[PDB]
Amino acid sequence: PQITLWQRPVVTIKIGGQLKEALLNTGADDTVLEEVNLPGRWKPKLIGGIGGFVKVRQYDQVPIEICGHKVIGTVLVGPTPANVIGRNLMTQIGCTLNF
Amino acid sequence: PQITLWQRPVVTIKIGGQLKEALLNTGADDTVLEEVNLPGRWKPKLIGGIGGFVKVRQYDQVPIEICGHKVIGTVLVGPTPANVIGRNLMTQIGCTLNF
């Protein structure tokens, strides 16, 4: 698709057999999702940092569908003011900024 | 241009006869720039909000050049961990997300 930016670029994602809403955020390096019980091994990761860090769980090679594009990538799971799709998953879906 | 998102989408902007660097951030509604002595009238605006707001100066109809695209738009001037181009200026330059 082509998404214009008059509104916040909120899209539907599919992960853990759940449909969710997330913001396409080019200002974010990584993808952070509210708590979800993804299966298997994970490793601790610190995100944020301004005023202190937030600890989340890094899951790798996660199948996730974004706007009906199935891709594989790293998803961080833990507290976030809203689900955020970062640049790491945007490269996987072949999402670019164009003007 | 077409900007891929393997790296942070930092671009050169031109404002107040100054060249600066700023991040193209689809996660941001508005454009926030470090203190710069833009001329003329402005009105107070509160930004952020999580843990408290930050007061900045809203300047309207500001000429700004982004990647050599001259546009006109609202720029908020005050503290920011780095200069940020928000969706408001991205619509002016005709910048979209594509995949």
Side-chain angles (χ1 to χ4, degrees), chain B residues 75-96:
Chain B
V75 182
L76 310 181
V77 177
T80 176
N83 290 320
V84 180
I85 305 313
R87 290 186 297 98
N88 78 296
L89 293 197
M90 283 186 280
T91 64
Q92 298 309 114
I93 66 173
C95 180
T96 56

Side-chain angles (χ1 to χ4, degrees), chain A residues 11 24 27 59 77:
Chain A
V11 296
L24 293 180
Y59 289 91
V77 177

Side-chain angles (χ1 to χ4, degrees), chain A:
Chain A
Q2 169 166 108
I3 302 176
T4 56
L5 297 168
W6 307 94
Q7 311 306 321
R8 293 178 178 172
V10 175
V11 296
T12 295
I13 67 173
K14 199 163 192 189
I15 186 173
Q18 286 163 263
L19 284 182
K20 298 203 181 88
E21 301 284 290
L23 178 73
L24 293 180
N25 190 339
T26 62
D29 306 327
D30 302 312
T31 292
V32 181
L33 295 188
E34 303 177 41
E35 185 55 55
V36 51
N37 196 9
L38 293 186
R41 184 167 49 239
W42 54 266
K43 67 203 224 186
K45 184 171 175 67
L46 298 168
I47 55 165
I50 299 179
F53 292 79
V54 165
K55 183 178 318 191
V56 295
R57 298 200 312 290
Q58 174 175 340
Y59 289 91
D60 296 320
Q61 291 158 0
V62 181
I64 176 158
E65 197 175 25
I66 301 173
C67 267
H69 280 59
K70 284 186 279 177
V71 290
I72 294 298
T74 288
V75 182
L76 310 181
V77 177
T80 176
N83 290 320
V84 180
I85 305 313
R87 290 186 297 98
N88 78 296
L89 293 197
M90 283 186 280
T91 64
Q92 298 309 114
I93 66 173
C95 180
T96 56
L97 288 161
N98 298 266
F99 60 102

